[PDB]
Ligand binder design. Structure first.
Ligand SMILES: Nc1ncnc2c1ncn2[C@@H]1O[C@H](COP(=O)(O)OP(=O)(O)O)[C@@H](O)[C@H]1O
Ligand SMILES: Nc1ncnc2c1ncn2[C@@H]1O[C@H](COP(=O)(O)OP(=O)(O)O)[C@@H](O)[C@H]1O
Ligand SMILES: [Mg+2]
Ligand SMILES: [Mg+2]
Ligand SMILES: [Zn+2]
Ligand SMILES: [Zn+2]
Ligand SMILES: [Zn+2]
Ligand SMILES: [Zn+2]
Ligand SMILES: [Zn+2]
Ligand SMILES: [Zn+2]
Lengths: 590, 186, 396, 590
RNA sequence: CCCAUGUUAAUAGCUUCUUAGGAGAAUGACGUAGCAUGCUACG
RNA sequence: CGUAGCAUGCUACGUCAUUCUCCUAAGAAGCUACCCC
């Protein structure tokens, strides 16, 4: 197994095996990496270990090559050559390994444990190969941290669907939501076979778990569930394809007089036709997603793949397309698992259609015309590498806003991330400016956009709407539960259920609280359609009921509050907890 | 070799001995410097032989490492090619009738000799002369394996398409024989 | 488990005396890679034991042919040499005898593997050799039976089959005698016990099997190379019928091999100072070497000329590249020197003079092309008969 | 690598490496060549250099062979043999190298730089192998002189198609026409990738360049264009296949009573059927090309390849064939590039057809029947070798006139070439006479042919036409521009545009001026179909407007003026510059 | 002061050649132990 | 006469160079048996 160095792109056959992601390294780079960090295990075409059976010494600083094997100094053969020598480590293509001085960044990336903000800003200002490697090892660290969760052994079976569980003490219990899956095991002193894949939900009442299983086996007391981890695969494609301006529009055929509402976006459509890739930054609810729809209309002879990081974001993109684009060329690809509710109005799972909608992780390896990535802020460099590896295309559009909430980054806990380091595209947006820019809200009425222009957005919005007097505030605290470290506020849900009648137009309102456990709780007590803030950001609703649960660092972030409120098409009632956040916006008092 | 300090000791022993010989030094000092020249020559020769064997061993092991890298790189290529062939042959499978007969089987085990016979969409009949062609697939439709087939193409030995109207008894010798006749299931 | 296995059929490209196309069956590596592992210890113990019945691996050079032909005459009474030839041996061999060969070749595994392991090895051999899928020019056919000529255990399985037919002919010839004409009172008792051990006895009788095998190696001494046999049968016993003559082999091949071995292709030599007529397609003659008489194998002296004049690859036409090919041909064709006929004897001198002329023109071209002759030229012994005569001497 | 000597055809393995074309040489010939000229570098199977790493001595007069390598006298091994010795140079097949006394011609050919007329006449009177070698090294010298042109860095981008360039000072700027191509380079401190192949044209107004690119990349300021050179490949076939007369017609089957107009050409058709190759020389417009058409008709069972040096010449041959020959067996092969406008009426690029038309350089390697080479005067020995290497045939016809203008030979600048040294076939024509000869003009009216019989043609023409009173002369000077050393005369174009109406029958006239830049200028101001004089010579037009630009050595050559005027089928107006040239012909005064 | 152009099996035997390793032998150089002879100091 | 030191010569062991022989491994090229009479 030969390859290219991840630091200087020279031919080589060494792999620093102490790294979790196991990258290739040139000889000089491998020596400079194993001389500095605690990485003391190098894998050649066969591992550098003392091949004498009665020894365990693996460090490459002291291993000697003899005959056709490797030995320590104690089992050293009469004729032996030192591996770590004269500034290099012995390996293939030794004479053509051009060294590099960028070993400090590679050491810091492969050594740090992705906890402080320094590691992330190091993961976005480095070279392209270092960008890819940092994103891949970050994903691997996330997977290994997921692997360190507890084991759920049942105590008794309450019903055919309801189960009573107990998690093994000493390891933190994973939170209960639709993303996490488990594999069941039946221990009858033999035959430890996978009895099925189960997804868990917290019950309505009591310490109960509602399970949904692929299999229909009856659970017994001895069965225990273990969380499954996905093997993160390596990536190859660059984060951003190199920009190449074109003198004239290629691969596209414009259509005269597409519509009247898309009049002001014609020049930006031509600009997207011009450049190889382009970026569109705008404040929320300014037609950024609808710009992509008009872009699809303006070039009807283009096989367009809309892709997005989230799920309900791509579903809202599908809904907007059905509103404007002709239906019978659009498809919505869902994965094989598809444990979350998708949007079923287009011909589902039709790769061969012209207007194909997909999540980033579910993209099929295909050629395409102009591909539109939606909500770049929600995505990391792994997602950009995936979308640039699976979809080979002639035009790329990246639409999204740096001001919105980014990807979760569960590993990060200390320090806060600046917007410009969200990923490569957001860095492009905040370095040289967006290629296209449009700010004026066509979504929200005047008071909410005025407040959000008093918020994180330094006042720039000039929205075309008037005060609809449908924006309401509350202040009362409520009680916290801290179920699985996903808090639920029962009295706030009760007050929302109380309201619910005095203004009957809010019976079709949509519930917003990030707090996935409280989002599931809201589906029972009042039964409104509900959505978490993260799976939001791309859809909108006429009436929005937003509930701030706890005055924590999570549900008081200005980006999260802004992106929660700015989905209100005509009206929103927000019940607030923080005195400062509630006082910072101008709604009615209540 | 020459980089080792033993070579330097050999050089300085040679220099001292040559200086003593040029200066006409005494027999005891000349014998001592001859001993120094001998022990330097011996030590340096031992070092040179050890260095040569070391270089031979290192370039034997790097040859072995090249060979093993080539082997492990060919294995991955063969594995990828084998998986490609298996998934393409999967893609060609007629998953309706084949699945029907398998789900119709006793334990799901059907003998292989009837997998084509009941599911193959294409039937290549090979006919050696006109006397057989009259008695096996006369006309544009014939019956084989209890299903009706329709002729789609008739090619000759050198793969030049022959229309069905040219296969006549008087026109038989002019044809290039055995005729691969490709038919489709109906 | 069981691994069914496609085997391709290719056409061999080699010199041959008749126009029928010859096909060789290439067996897939999934079957060779296990048949070698299962059988290699036996297939090396057979090919490294000298002086036995299955002479596979006894070199015909270095006085090895004379040792073969003296370990055939293992003190039989009034010898006559007999040779048979199975017509369509590798195609008409019944499936039952192939199973028989693959069992007797797998009886050695009494310790290394269990019973069901031996049976699944038998089923894998009978699915990857006996009744397999033959890929014959872009199409999978089913081979109804008969051993493929390309698996790991081909020549040895054919040797076991050949010994099976020889012993079956002997059993038929010994049973089918009138019984009251067998005057030798030991032999009549042997037939009366042979019938009982055949039909009136269900389990083995190792005392009688040992007695009968000693009888066979006393009066039917045999030499086998996979189907090429030479038998040194006692003449009086064959005439009385107590041992398998040719006609018994015709009958046995009729009802067990399903073919008819016409008596025009199975020879009988009534003398011994002339050796077997044709074994391994190399005739045998008695020469005087040194002080004593030894047998020498000489090839059909037309096959050597056919191998000289015709070459399967165009680069072998050039001659001057190939001196290390005419050396091998001359080594194979040297015993023609001592043949009483002269036109046979001239072939070896033709090859010697041709090697000398080839080397003369080679040094001519390597003196024109470069400017200096070769430094250490050591082709001065290939055109001397002393090297080839040393090649057939009993020293090494 | 062994081969045959280019001087005596002996087996050898030496190559005089100082030559640009690197020819094989026998040992004696190599010694005689390196002893006389400055050629002091001989390549054997490995180069003759001092293999000691600390030396650079390459001359073969002093190099000594030792061990298995070569050394100078300073690094000479204890046992060594001198290479240059006793009249030979050491190499393979040393004992069978028969020497030759023709080393003077080979020295003069491989040494001279192809500037004076002596080199060319030495390149046509030598042996066959020397003919081929001289033509090949002349082509190589032309390519290397093409390589020495400047680099065009842009200054700004005027439009999507219009560009403003600047050529690097110190190297002459190549002229702007359709033949010269460039490769673009984008220097962004890295990634110097070929951004496309561009052809340049001088703009209508101002110092502007109109570019046509294979790629559609938008040009920026930093991109620079470098001229591309074609690697001239070696040739093997002889210039002329050996003539072998036949007793009777072979490979052909004559047809009785083909037509009435071809009556006088029947005997020449039989003569072409007789000989292996034949030559037809005639004055312009005497049916030489139409003779080949009647030759095709007379032997309809012959797969005929018409080939020609020029492009519009083979296009006019196609047009004449469509006029006479049945259409559905004729094909016109254009190259893959085909940057010049071809003739699109036959089945384009059909090698398998019977009547195949092609340029010399675009010929496919094929067998054929009788092959007709058109305008041999336009072609050099490289072209004859190419046509004799790619087309293996049973009959060869070479038609053309020595009196017309020859191949350009851009290297030649001092002295003038006699006609008989144009190539091998023209030498054959002017030595022993043409095999077939026909002089009587069936093209031009009486006055023009009378003038051309007063011109270079010593009076022999007896044309069958009368004075049509459609031949006109002018005298005024005009202004010179000297664009890229291809002059343009704007007032002459203006006077032609002025005329243009008073005689409306000349609105379909065709513009003739060699001067490719002025030819492109004429396409804008008056828009007449136009053609340069060199790409002419094989076509004809009813009305011809000929404009002599400058009284230079180029557009006053009598051959060029004759071949420009004699394309006039019915009439010509020539506006002249030279007093003597204008007075030498008898048209109307104006 | 410039104009033409890019197409084919398994097994077995044997011969030859190369490389690597091991063993042994021989010769020579060189070095450490043992034996003998001769010179010096001391007893 | 002995001890210590030095010189010369003769044996035992170690390192290097050269040659020869034998074997074991690996590799390359070729032929024959095979196939049919
Ligand atoms: N020119 C316009 N005319 C009418 N409606 C518009 C116009 N531009 C934007 N809108 C409305 O504004 C909304 C913006 O939607 P979207 O692009 O999804 O916002 P975001 O990009 O913030 O998610 C669309 O639903 C669209 O109906
Ligand atoms: N016998 C003839 N009858 C009628 N027209 C003729 C005859 N001979 C020649 N021509 C005309 O003379 C012209 C000569 O054309 P061509 O051979 O192309 O001249 P050139 O060889 O000088 O280019 C042809 O177009 C043809 O029409
Ligand atoms: Mg949006
Ligand atoms: Mg002409
Ligand atoms: Zn590392
Ligand atoms: Zn590196
Ligand atoms: Zn060790
Ligand atoms: Zn030269
Ligand atoms: Zn020569
Ligand atoms: Zn030198």
């Amino acid at each position: 197994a030969v390859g290219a160095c991840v630091l200087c792109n020279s031919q080589t056959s060494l792999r620093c095996g102490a790294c979790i992601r196991r990258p290739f390294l040139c000889c000089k780079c491998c020596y400079d990496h194993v001389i500095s960090t605690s990485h003391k295990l190098v894998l050649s075409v066969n591992p550098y270990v003392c091949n004498a059976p009665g020894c365990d010494v693996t460090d490459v600083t002291q291993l000697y090559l003899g005959g056709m094997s490797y030995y320590c100094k104690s089992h050293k053969p009469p004729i032996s050559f030192p591996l770590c020598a004269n500034g290099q480590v012995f390996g293939l293509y030794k004479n053509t390994c051009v060294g590099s001085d960028n070993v400090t960044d590679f050491n810091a990336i492969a050594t740090c444990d992705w906890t402080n903000a320094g590691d992330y800003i190091l993961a976005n200002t480095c070279t392209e190969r270092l960008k890819l490697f940092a994103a891949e090892t970050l994903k691997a660290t996330e997977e290994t941290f997921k692997l360190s969760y507890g084991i759920a052994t049942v105590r008794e079976v309450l019903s055919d669907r309801e189960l009573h569980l107990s998690w093994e003490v000493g390891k933190p219990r994973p939170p209960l939501n639709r993303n996490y899956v488990f594999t069941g095991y039946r221990v009858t002193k033999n035959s430890k076979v996978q009895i099925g894949e189960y997804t868990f939900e917290k019950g309505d009442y009591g310490d109960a778990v509602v399970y949904r299983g692929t299999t229909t086996y009856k659970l017994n007391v001895g069965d225990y569930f273990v969380l499954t981890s996905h093997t993160v695969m390596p990536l190859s494609a660059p984060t951003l394809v190199p920009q190449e301006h074109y003198v004239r529009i290629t691969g596209l055929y414009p259509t005269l007089n597409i519509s009247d509402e898309f009049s002001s976006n014609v020049a930006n459509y031509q600009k997207v036709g011009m450049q190889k890739y382009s970026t569109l930054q705008g404040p929320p609810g300014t037609g950024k997603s609808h710009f992509a729809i008009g872009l699809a209309l303006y070039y009807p002879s283009a096989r367009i793949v809309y892709t997005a990081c989230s799920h309900a974001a791509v579903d809202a993109l599908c809904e907007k397309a059905l509103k404007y684009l002709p239906i019978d060329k659009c498809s919505r690809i869902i994965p094989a698992r598809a444990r979350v509710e998708c949007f079923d109005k287009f011909k589902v799972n039709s790769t061969l259609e012209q207007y194909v909608f997909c999540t980033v992780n579910a993209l099929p390896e295909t050629t395409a015309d102009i591909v539109v990535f939606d909500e770049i802020s929600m995505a990391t460099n792994y997602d950009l590498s995936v979308v640039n590896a699976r979809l080979r295309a002639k035009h790329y559009v990246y639409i999204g806003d740096p001001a919105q909430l980014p990807a979760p980054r569960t590993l990060l806990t200390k320090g806060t991330l600046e917007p410009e380091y969200f990923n490569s595209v957001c860095r492009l947006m905040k370095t040289i400016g967006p290629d296209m820019f449009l700010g004026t809200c066509r979504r929200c009425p005047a008071e909410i956009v005025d407040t959000v222009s008093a918020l994180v957005y330094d006042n720039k919005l000039k929205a075309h709407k008037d005060k609809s007097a449908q924006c309401f505030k509350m202040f009362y605290k409520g009680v916290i539960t801290h179920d699985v470290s996903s808090a639920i506020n029962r009295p706030q849900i009760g007050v929302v259920r109380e309201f619910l009648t005095r203004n009957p137009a809010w019976r079709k309102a949509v519930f917003i609280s990030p707090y996935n456990s409280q989002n599931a709780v809201a589906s029972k007590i009042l039964g409104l359609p509900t959505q978490t803030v993260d799976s939001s950001q791309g859809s909108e609703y006429d009436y929005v009921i937003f509930t701030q649960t706890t005055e924590t660092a999570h549900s008081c972030n200005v980006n999260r509050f802004n992106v929660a409120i700015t989905r209100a098409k005509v009206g929103i009632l927000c019940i607030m907890s923080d005195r400062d956040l509630y006082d910072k916006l101008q709604f009615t008092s209540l | 070799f020459s980089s080792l300090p033993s070579y330097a000791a050999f050089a300085t022993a040679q220099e001292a001995y040559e200086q003593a010989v040029a200066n006409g030094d005494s027999e005891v000092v000349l014998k001592k410097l001859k001993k120094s020249l001998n022990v330097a020559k011996s030590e340096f020769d031992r070092d040179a032989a050890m260095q040569r064997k070391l270089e031979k061993m290192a370039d034997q092991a790097m040859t072995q490492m090249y060979k093993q890298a080539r082997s492990e790189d060919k294995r991955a290529k063969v594995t990828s090619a084998m998986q490609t062939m298996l998934f393409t042959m999967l893609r060609k499978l007629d998953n309706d009738a084949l699945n029907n007969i398998i789900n119709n089987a006793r334990d799901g085990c059907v003998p292989l000799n009837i997998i084509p016979l009941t599911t193959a969409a294409k039937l290549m009949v090979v006919i050696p002369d006109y006397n057989t062609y009259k008695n096996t697939c006369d006309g544009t439709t014939f019956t084989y394996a209890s299903a009706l087939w329709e002729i789609q193409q008739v090619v000759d030995a050198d793969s030049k398409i022959v229309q069905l109207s040219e296969i006549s008894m008087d026109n038989s010798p002019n044809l290039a024989w055995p005729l691969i006749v490709t038919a489709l299931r109906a | 488990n069981v691994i069914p296995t496609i085997t391709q059929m290719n056409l061999k490209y080699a010199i041959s005396a008749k126009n029928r196309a010859r096909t060789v069956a290439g067996v897939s590596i999934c079957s060779t890679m296990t048949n070698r592992q299962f059988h290699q210890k036996l297939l090396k113990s057979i090919a490294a034991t000298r002086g036995a019945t299955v002479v596979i691996g006894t070199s015909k050079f270095y006085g090895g042919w004379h040792n073969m032909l003296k370990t055939v005459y293992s003190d039989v009474e009034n010898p006559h040499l007999m040779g048979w030839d199975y017509p369509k041996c590798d195609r008409a061999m019944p499936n039952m005898l192939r199973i028989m060969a693959s069992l007797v070749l797998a009886r050695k595994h009494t310790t290394c593997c269990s019973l069901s392991h031996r049976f699944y090895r038998l089923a894998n051999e009978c699915a990857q050799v006996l009744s397999e899928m033959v890929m014959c020019g872009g199409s999978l056919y089913v081979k109804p039976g008969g051993t493929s000529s390309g698996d790991a255990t081909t020549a040895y399985a054919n040797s076991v089959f050949n010994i099976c037919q020889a012993v079956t002919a002997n059993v038929n010839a010994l049973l089918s005698t009138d019984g009251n004409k067998i005057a030798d009172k030991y032999v009549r008792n042997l037939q009366h016990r042979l019938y009982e051990c055949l039909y009136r006895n269900r389990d083995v009788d190792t005392d009688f099997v040992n007695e009968f095998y000693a009888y066979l190696r006393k009066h039917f001494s045999m030499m086998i190379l996979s189907d090429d046999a030479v038998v040194c049968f006692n003449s009086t016993y064959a005439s009385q019928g107590l041992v398998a003559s040719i006609k018994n082999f015709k009958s046995v091949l009729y009802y067990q091999n399903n073919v008819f071995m016409s008596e025009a292709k199975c020879w009988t030599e009534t003398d011994l100072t002339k050796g077997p007529h044709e074994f391994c397609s190399q005739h045998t003659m008695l020469v005087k070497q040194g002080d004593d008489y030894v047998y020498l194998p000489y090839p059909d002296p037309s096959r050597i000329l056919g191998a000289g004049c015709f070459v399967d690859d165009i680069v072998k036409t050039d001659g001057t590249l190939m001196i290390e090919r005419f050396v091998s041909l001359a080594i194979d064709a040297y015993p023609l020197t001592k043949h009483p006929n002269q036109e046979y004897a001239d072939v070896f001198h033709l090859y010697l003079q041709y090697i000398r002329k080839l080397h003369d023109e080679l040094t001519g071209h390597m003196l024109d092309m470069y400017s200096v002759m070769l430094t250490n030229d050591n082709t001065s012994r290939y055109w001397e008969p002393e090297f080839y005569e040393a090649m057939y001497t009993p020293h090494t």
